[PDB]
Structure 1
Amino acid sequence: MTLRAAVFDLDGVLALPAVFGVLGRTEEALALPRGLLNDAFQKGGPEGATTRLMKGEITLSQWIPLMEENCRKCSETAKVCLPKNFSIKEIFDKAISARKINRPMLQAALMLRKKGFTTAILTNTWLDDRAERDGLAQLMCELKMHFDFLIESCQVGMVKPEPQIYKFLLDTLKASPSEVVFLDDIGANLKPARDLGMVTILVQDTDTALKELEKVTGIQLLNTPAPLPTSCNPSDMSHGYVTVKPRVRLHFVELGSGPAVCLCHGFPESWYSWRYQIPALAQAGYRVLAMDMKGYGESSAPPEIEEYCMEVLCKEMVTFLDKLGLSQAVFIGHDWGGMLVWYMALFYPERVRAVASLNTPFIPANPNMSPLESIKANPVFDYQLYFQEPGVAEAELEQNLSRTFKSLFRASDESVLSMHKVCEAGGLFVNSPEEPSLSRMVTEEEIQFYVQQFKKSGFRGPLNWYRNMERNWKWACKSLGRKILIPALMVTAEKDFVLVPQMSQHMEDWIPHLKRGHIEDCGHWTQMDKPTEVNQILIKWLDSDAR
């Protein structure tokens, strides 16, 4: 009163259904004396097998037989048989995976952390060495990244409801009994909290629990809006660096395990533009590698225009796989990244497990008509022309990097950048403000992140991507006999007024088994505009087509 810390039980609070509640169904299922299992589990109390397990004295595999023993003699003093195929191991395997994250609680945890609460899990638990231990390990990873602390009984050598562990909790939280909330499904584990003077909640059904927590903290926790996906903190990410050419080195951030997925951002962005997708796809069972594309961030940024034609760009990505020892990867790209991704499927399909683009359609080059012509053809591409002259587009873009991104990164219903008559107007920003408002799509902090990156090498490199029209076209014409017959998803964005969804309308001709996806009310900056639906669409497709 008032609080600034929130502590969560695992079994039956952050994870449901609890293992003790499978313990119980088992009895009913097999017509066992009510509580037989539980008798054998709690057996010996503080000096028995189960407690030793929770303190890390012995392992779960070690405990299994001691439990089965106790079940014998619990069922001896009760005078009853034991079923043909009785396995404490099978019962506990089922229970342990049956248990999933309790989403609303986790969200509640997130909320409170977001408003500056120190969050911690206090959980009686064991050193798991069963052959199927990896599942609980996954669970525990997913959770722990969202908390300041994961205090586990077997790691600390103390157990709930033993006071020592609470003194240790307070100790770890650098906070006082009256500044802390502790929720648990077990009254016994609450009484101690109380005696130090802690706010406590007996977590029965989750919704009432949240009601108490809501009240006593004064923050809306129930019924609050759909929260964004998890976003990366750059300094907590694995940063990878692969040189692919004497003086070109590509950097990327990597997270997760399973089939390699290579994310490729558009102009003028950064691996950070995939912050919402990195955790989600990792969590869905993949190994995300989010690029700094050539010209950006910590990836190299050589001046020469040719060093950014699609061909050299693509060979380089091949090399990238080569040097990481990856025979393939599923390639997902957006804006410029999309185009490349398609051209990877067209030229190196043996290396592409699957291809995917957000917004960017696949258009075949017109062998007759040039591309400078084809671009002047549609007025909404005028900005492309303005970018041709080395040095002009950079001067403007670099002059106030904050202004620039603040001006670029806006939701469909927010715009400040018309894209037509830019050459004539004489600037991308000729008639946009010096200090633009902050979009709904990005915290001030997220903008500053991009500003830092772009101080490294400016816009020369990025703008060169637009400066190989004639070359890319010539190269592209080599592929005019081919089709894309590998798994490909196309993902159009209703309100992207430059990569318009109609531009993809014939893509099936060259990509006949193409699968589509589409986002209402979503602008050009797909990833940060609609991160949830992007994750849903992509994860879905990955699972269906990348296995």
Structure 2
Amino acid sequence: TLRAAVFDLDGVLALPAVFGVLGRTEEALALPRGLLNDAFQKGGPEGATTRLMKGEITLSQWIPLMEENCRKCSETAKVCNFSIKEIFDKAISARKINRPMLQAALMLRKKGFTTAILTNTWLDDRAERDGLAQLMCELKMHFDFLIESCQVGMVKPEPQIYKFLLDTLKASPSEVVFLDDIGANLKPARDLGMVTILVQDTDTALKELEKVTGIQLLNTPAPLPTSCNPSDMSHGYVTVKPRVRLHFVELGSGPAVCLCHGFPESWYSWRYQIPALAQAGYRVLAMDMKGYGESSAPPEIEEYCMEVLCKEMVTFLDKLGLSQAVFIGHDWGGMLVWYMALFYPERVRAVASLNTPFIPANPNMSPLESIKANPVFDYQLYFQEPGVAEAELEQNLSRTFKSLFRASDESVLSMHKVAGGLFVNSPEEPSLSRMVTEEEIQFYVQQFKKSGFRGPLNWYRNMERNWKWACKSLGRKILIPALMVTAEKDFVLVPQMSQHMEDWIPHLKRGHIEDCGHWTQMDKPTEVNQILIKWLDSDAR
């Protein structure tokens, strides 16, 4: 039975094939048929191309040798602005990930298959080498192995590369499916006993792959975006003051994008956004906000007022040597992010909030008076008394997260009349939401075992201090780039609460997600990524 799948890069995992450019240049330039493909493979196993593919020489060294072969091939054929460099630069740049092939590779791996890329490639030292470096990076991370001819000094169709592939896979030939667009390179794999697919069009190739593996790969439901494996991330730590350190997860290059979670969450709440935003060209810093996970959680209520939290996020930027970051927040993090824009606009490249609207402080009313004027916020009153909510929330962490993290139609908690507790008529063993796996709930369980709910709950215990501080901003407007993302089915932070935001943020941009509950990032990850990337590319650079 098959347990390994091997894919070629050019013309299999990446399209259009770099090989299909020589034939295209031939037709465009009205050159003799196969002329450029003849100069390319000249000398066979002893030629310049085999030397390049084995890593003996780099691409920049090979370019002049290819030109020589192009001259000799035109002299024999009796024929005659021409640049191999230009042709190849254009060909590499045009070559994109073959999404349905990657999706199929992703599905096989998810089902227990060991996946690998086996490719005849080169050491790219061109001034424009970054394009391919980016492509290889996005691709490679989805596979167990990447075997490149130039790193192993072996090439397809040499028998040794196939035995090397079996060795790294730790599998017998009959347990391997091998996909290649070049028939000759497919031959030695078949000779060993491997299942082989000659890839012409992706569709038929996947039909062939689906038949041999017995796994549905074609016509499957829309896959979720790439998530994060905590142990595979870069973890960063910044001391903002003697007793306070902030932890973050960091991925990508480009403008700094600081992600700020809500209550009672984690940097992990952004798991579906981190790979997408990094791939989109941003340097993502996903925080553990103060009171959470690996960040410090002092016990004092006043350590959690908006003024202190914002000041520390400024210090976080100072210590990392960042003059600005785009700030994206959800729930309490969304509230933090609006106050970062109001008090520190010079440090905020752009601001976005998921669910949390910007409602200015009412100077003619106490926050306690304002809260009582809405049944949806009654839970915030239950959070006031130190110790009460901590006791119920810390009692059973698995039940706490399983009850909280649910889609709109999966409601288990009765948030009105909080009876005497959040879990009044809630099951002791709630079912697992379609939004989360058991493993994901257990990550939140493990994070919350360090500091519990005290620090997180203290974010709600500074109403009076927050109101007084916020009143200092009443004459201001948010004039830096801003995005408000509303969730149709969030019944606490309702889209309707954001209706007057334009009065204070005149140039405000908007996004809206239908059939989406409170936990926006994991409820609708694909749509959050689409909205954020589109807004970042237009308004944050």
TM-score grouping bracket, smaller chain normalisation: over 0.9
2: CA distance between counterparts of 1:21 and 1:249?
A: 54
Map of 2:366 onto structure 1: 370
SS of corresponding position for 2:115: strand
2: CA distance between counterparts of 1:29 and 1:68?
A: 18
SS of corresponding position for 1:226: coil
Map of 1:57 onto structure 2: 56
1: CA distance between counterparts of 2:28 and 2:489?
A: 55
User: Which of these residues, 493, 513, 522, is aligned with residue 516 of structure 2?
Assistant: 522
Query: How high is the TM-score relative to the length of structure 1?
Result: 0.99
* 4+ long deviations beyond 2 Å: none
2: CA distance between counterparts of 1:25 and 1:274?
A: 44
SS of corresponding position for 2:275: helix
- Structure 1, unaligned runs of 5 or more: none
SS of corresponding position for 2:473: helix
1: CA distance between counterparts of 2:74 and 2:22?
A: 15
Deviation at 1:502, TM superposition (A): 0.3
1:420 aligns with 2:428: no
2: CA distance between counterparts of 1:23 and 1:470?
A: 71
2: CA distance between counterparts of 1:471 and 1:353?
A: 27
1: CA distance between counterparts of 2:528 and 2:208?
A: 35
Deviation at 1:532, TM superposition (A): 0.1
Map of 1:153 onto structure 2: 149
* 1:483-519 CA distance string (max 9 Å, x none): 0000000000000000000000000000000000000
Deviation at 1:413, TM superposition (A): 0.8
Deviation at 1:264, TM superposition (A): 0.2
- Asked if the contact 2:414/2:425 (under 8 Å) is kept, the reply is no
Paired residue total: 541
What does 1:466-505 correspond to in 2, within 5 Å? 466-505=460-499
* 1:359-410 CA distance string (max 9 Å, x none): 0000100001010110011011111000000000000000000000000000
SS of corresponding position for 1:181: strand
* 1:339-362 CA distance string (max 9 Å, x none): 000000000000000000000000
* 1:403-436 CA distance string (max 9 Å, x none): 00000000001010121100xx100001100000
2: CA distance between counterparts of 1:350 and 1:176?
A: 60
SS of corresponding position for 1:20: helix
2: CA distance between counterparts of 1:116 and 1:456?
A: 33
1: CA distance between counterparts of 2:15 and 2:446?
A: 43
1:437 aligns with 2:436: no
SS of corresponding position for 1:485: coil
- Structure 2, unaligned runs of 5 or more: none
Deviation at 1:279, TM superposition (A): 0.2
SS of corresponding position for 1:363: coil
1: CA distance between counterparts of 2:104 and 2:461?
A: 49
Deviation at 1:273, TM superposition (A): 0.1
Deviation at 1:328, TM superposition (A): 0.1
Map of 1:408 onto structure 2: 404
* 1:246-273 CA distance string (max 9 Å, x none): 0100000000000000000000000000
SS of corresponding position for 2:381: helix
Map of 1:29 onto structure 2: 28
SS of corresponding position for 1:367: coil
* 1:287-328 CA distance string (max 9 Å, x none): 000000000000000000000000000000000000000000
Map of 1:236 onto structure 2: 232
SS of corresponding position for 1:201: strand
1: CA distance between counterparts of 2:198 and 2:169?
A: 21
Deviation at 1:199, TM superposition (A): 0.2
2: CA distance between counterparts of 1:194 and 1:509?
A: 69
1: CA distance between counterparts of 2:36 and 2:161?
A: 27
2: CA distance between counterparts of 1:86 and 1:191?
A: 35
2: CA distance between counterparts of 1:462 and 1:22?
A: 57
* 1:23-48 CA distance string (max 9 Å, x none): 11100000100011000000000000
* 1:61-98 CA distance string (max 9 Å, x none): 000000001000100101111xxx10000000000010
1: CA distance between counterparts of 2:392 and 2:141?
A: 40
Deviation at 1:22, TM superposition (A): 1.0
* 1:113-133 CA distance string (max 9 Å, x none): 000000000000000000000
- Asked if the contact 2:399/2:430 (under 8 Å) is kept, the reply is yes
SS of corresponding position for 2:286: strand
2: CA distance between counterparts of 1:207 and 1:510?
A: 52
SS of corresponding position for 1:356: strand
Deviation at 1:156, TM superposition (A): 0.6
SS of corresponding position for 2:276: helix
Deviation at 1:210, TM superposition (A): 0.2
1: CA distance between counterparts of 2:377 and 2:484?
A: 21
2: CA distance between counterparts of 1:254 and 1:349?
A: 23
2: CA distance between counterparts of 1:389 and 1:379?
A: 18
1: CA distance between counterparts of 2:56 and 2:350?
A: 48
SS of corresponding position for 2:49: helix
CA RMSD of aligned residues (A): 0.4
- Asked if the contact 2:487/2:514 (under 8 Å) is kept, the reply is yes
2: CA distance between counterparts of 1:111 and 1:180?
A: 16
- Asked if the contact 2:7/2:180 (under 8 Å) is kept, the reply is yes
Map of 1:535 onto structure 2: 529
- Asked if the contact 2:115/2:144 (under 8 Å) is kept, the reply is yes
2: CA distance between counterparts of 1:255 and 1:73?
A: 48
* 1:411-468 CA distance string (max 9 Å, x none): 001010121100xx10000110000000000000000000000000000000000000
2: CA distance between counterparts of 1:193 and 1:546?
A: 49
SS of corresponding position for 2:461: coil
2: CA distance between counterparts of 1:369 and 1:23?
A: 74
2: CA distance between counterparts of 1:158 and 1:391?
A: 66
1: CA distance between counterparts of 2:23 and 2:469?
A: 67
- Asked if the contact 2:60/2:125 (under 8 Å) is kept, the reply is yes
2: CA distance between counterparts of 1:497 and 1:155?
A: 56
* 1:498-544 CA distance string (max 9 Å, x none): 00000000000000000000000000000000000000000000000
Deviation at 1:206, TM superposition (A): 0.2
2: CA distance between counterparts of 1:499 and 1:418?
A: 16
1:461 aligns with 2:449: no
SS of corresponding position for 1:479: coil
Deviation at 1:112, TM superposition (A): 0.3
SS of corresponding position for 1:239: strand
1: CA distance between counterparts of 2:88 and 2:336?
A: 49
2: CA distance between counterparts of 1:314 and 1:235?
A: 29
SS of corresponding position for 1:192: helix
SS of corresponding position for 1:491: strand
* 1:132-151 CA distance string (max 9 Å, x none): 00000000000000000000
- Asked if the contact 2:401/2:441 (under 8 Å) is kept, the reply is yes
Map of 1:164 onto structure 2: 160
